[PDB]
């Protein structure tokens, strides 16, 4: 071989040349995940915007509207489709980028239901249904409600990317980012498998029309419906070496817009800002074998919905689906759900935790780890620091449960005993410095927890690093823009 | 106590022990800056949110009420005050986060003007005063901007700070921070002296009520009105070792909300973007002696406006005030006014600038030092990092200049033709690794500018490092968590039991 005299010792790989083996967890367990690794040369792409993004996915096929909206055959032959650059899924059909005035104006907000801007929409909606006009009891309907359904449902159509079988979805270099929308893997009548993400910056999946549901809580809450990747109907999923984050639109940015005080609630607290994000990837449904490892994941309130309900059933609360492994992750400034787990058996080894309890900070922890409705954490040498004013951290702070006595007796009927143990286990935590149990917090945070009867090592191989320098080692090498040098 | 720049970052003191020692620069000359240091025990206070500050600095005469105002007597008093983890400025007397909802609410937006929104008051707003429905042939006015100007207000009142007379305000560890507001060195009805401030991190002044101003710069602008520090009042002031930013709100997320092309101008430009912030330290008036030293300055568009006016006056364009001396500093990600300069006797040496022109950037560069209105400018090794896809960065993207001589010569029958020139000098600025000719590039911005008659060698002593190492030193040893240790964890009554 040949090293050139002026040649850098230290550069990291060129930029477009990773590939899609190394799957590790539950993603590699029983069959191996690959990807598009194989792809023909005519299914080797390179794409710069949306609608490139979408002829790949969909093997020039794809009638892209003037909407931006898609119709098609989703392509199930191996892929491999390298991001280049900025795509910003929040443009039409002529890739220019939607505004929520468009949105409205492009829509029935306008068409059927006069709106002249999003602003006015906006004004009209918050005097219909705040709480001292509304109140608590129902949820929200009426012209405005329909106006912004209309401007959603448009959105929707826009921002959300429907993702097939046997796709590798590979950033080039340092700069690679896919901005405002939402990977779907899979839908109830498409469930796919074999997907591979890697070196890529997810941002602020940001959903212009959130609604008020004002009986969410008891007291109300805003909601929006867009994940950065969404993993509901689909099987063998690598999620490796991305970052995600709310982007340059974090949460406090966008505070209640309520000032009433009523029923002993101040609706001008931070319960009740307007939320324009949802989850970071949210694993539900028949979502299963996914591993998300090397990632950075900072700067947003609610990161890891892993099942979507208490309620046990084959769809949506099945104890045999739902087995995520989370491994040298860093789960920075995250407020909570990091992760939730309900039904699942999942297993978080060798990731960095750091954020403060602060209260007035960007993104104040709130919880860390929730066992929740028969969910099976399992928890390996991972590192914790938290900061906060008045007292040390304590393990409570880390790990919590959520569990229903009722919901684990109708879970019984459906699946068997073992199956609906809602169990914890933690080995090597490392909080702020010194030995943390965060068993012993689950146990005080719930009595219904229970013995566990799984461990990962009965289903695939892995290495525990030790914790010792893991925080320096997981910040020098996690996330985008570590695999590939810049283009 | 003295902590070397170039000192182990393992010696740095005990969290909460940093005293207001070391002024250097033009806050070091005549009666050199202290700050509270020598205050009385009863003068020692450690503040962990606004109602403490405000109480330190009032020496516990502030009636803070109900909405966060203040009434009450600022302390003339030496004092030191140590600043315990986050403190929001933008919150009410109870501590309650402010939202504009509850500005529009708890104003006269809504007792007068009758909005019940600020969703309503922002619509009528951008209905009545948008480019094609006001023109640009006159300033804003009526009921919106009424309401917007009673909602400004409050939000003034609550997240300006007054600093009296001989005060240190000094970061704990190294996280102790400052929010969403304005420390204002002096007020027009008491100025003040001999100010020191380090070891804080100071994010995002942000102004929830920026005014639309159709006639500024002809096309329009808006503008907002909060700095993390205004000094327009205070003499003999050190700010070291401290952190500024636009924190998490980067004006990014804050485009036009125009959509509309008036007399040839399309009014969704950048140059129409909702503006949030102000300045990062601005000096303007009477504010003099001023140093900021080794700090981290990032992320944000307009950092220092060092006098606020071409009009020349003892008032507000006075060329025996500002003297105000940057070295040692990290001017990282600003996009411009690094710093812009009228009138006064400023300094920059030995500071970092890091940044890029890439247009897709936060804060794309957009210029450097600015020589404005008799401005006289002296620098000296300073280190240039300006990055772009486009082209390579030059000279003239790193110092220009805005002279007028018809206000050359109103000058100078106010004060005096020596004091009205605009000058500027360089020595030892690098570029990209070579060598710049900053003087060369002013030259070319304005024929006007004129011979240097001052130096700063004559006004205090002061070493230039050297280039080569410089950017490696300041990123290491820049801003704020670099003077103390991090705080000991707080005790639980539990460890006393056994
Ligand atoms: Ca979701
Ligand atoms: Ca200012």
Redesign the pocket.
């Known amino acids: 071989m040949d090293i050139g005299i002026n040649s850098d010792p230290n550069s990291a790989a060129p930029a477009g040349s990773i590939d899609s083996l190394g799957a590790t967890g539950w993603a590699s367990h029983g069959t191996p995940t690959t990807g598009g690794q194989g792809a023909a040369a005519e299914r080797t792409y390179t794409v710069a915007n949306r609608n490139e993004l979408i002829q790949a996915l969909y093997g020039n096929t794809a009638v892209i509207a003037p909407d931006g909206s898609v119709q098609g055959t989703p392509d199930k032959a191996p892929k491999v489709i390298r991001i280049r650059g900025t795509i910003d899924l929040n443009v039409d059909g002529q890739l220019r980028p939607y505004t929520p005035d468009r949105y409205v104006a492009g829509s029935c907000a306008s068409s059927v239901h006069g709106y002249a801007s999003q602003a006015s929409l906006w004004s009209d909606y918050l005097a219909a249904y705040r709480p001292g006009a509304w109140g608590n009891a129902r949820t929200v309907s009426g012209k405005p409600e329909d106006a912004r359904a209309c401007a959603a449902e448009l959105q929707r159509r826009v921002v959300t990317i429907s993702v097939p079988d046997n796709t590798s979805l590979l950033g080039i270099g340092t700069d690679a980012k896919i901005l405002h929308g939402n990977l779907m893997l899979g839908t109830p009548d498409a469930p796919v498998a074999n997907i591979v993400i890697r070196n890529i910056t997810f941002e602020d999946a940001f959903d212009d029309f959130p609604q008020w549901d004002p009986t969410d809580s008891s007291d109300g809450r805003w909601n929006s419906?867009?994940?950065l990747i969404?993993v509901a109907h689909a099987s063998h999923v690598w999620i490796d070496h991305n970052t995600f984050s709310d982007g340059d639109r974090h949460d406090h940015a966008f505070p209640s817009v309520w000032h009433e005080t009523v029923h002993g609630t101040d609706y001008s607290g931070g319960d009740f800002k307007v939320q324009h994000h949802?989850?970071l990837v949210?694993v539900?449904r028949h979502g299963n074998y996914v591993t998300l490892s090397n990632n950075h994941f900072h700067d947003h309130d609610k990161a890891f919905?892993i099942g979507?309900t208490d309620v046990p059933g084959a769809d949506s609360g099945n104890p045999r689906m739902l087995k995520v492994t989370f491994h040298g992750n860093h789960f920075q400034n995250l407020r909570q759900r990091q992760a939730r787990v309900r039904y699942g058996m999942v297993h978080l080894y060798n990731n960095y935790y750091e954020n403060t309890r602060d209260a007035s900070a960007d993104y104040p922890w709130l919880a860390g780890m929730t066992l929740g409705q028969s969910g099976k954490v399992h928890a390996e040498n991972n590192v914790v620091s938290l900061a906060g004013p008045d007292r040390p951290a304590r393990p409570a702070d880390v790990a919590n449960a959520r569990i229903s006595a009722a919901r684990t007796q109708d879970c019984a009927a459906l699946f068997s005993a073992s199956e609906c143990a809602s169990t914890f286990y933690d080995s090597g935590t490392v909080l702020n410095g010194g030995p943390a149990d965060l068993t012993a917090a689950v146990r005080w945070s719930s009595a219904l927890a229970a013995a566990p009867a799984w461990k990962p090592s009965d289903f695939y191989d892995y290495t525990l690093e030790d914790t010792a320098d893991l925080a320096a080692r997981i910040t020098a090498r996690a996330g985008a823009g570590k695999l590939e040098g810049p283009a």
């Open positions: 419906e867009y994940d969404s949802d989850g949210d539900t919905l979507g």
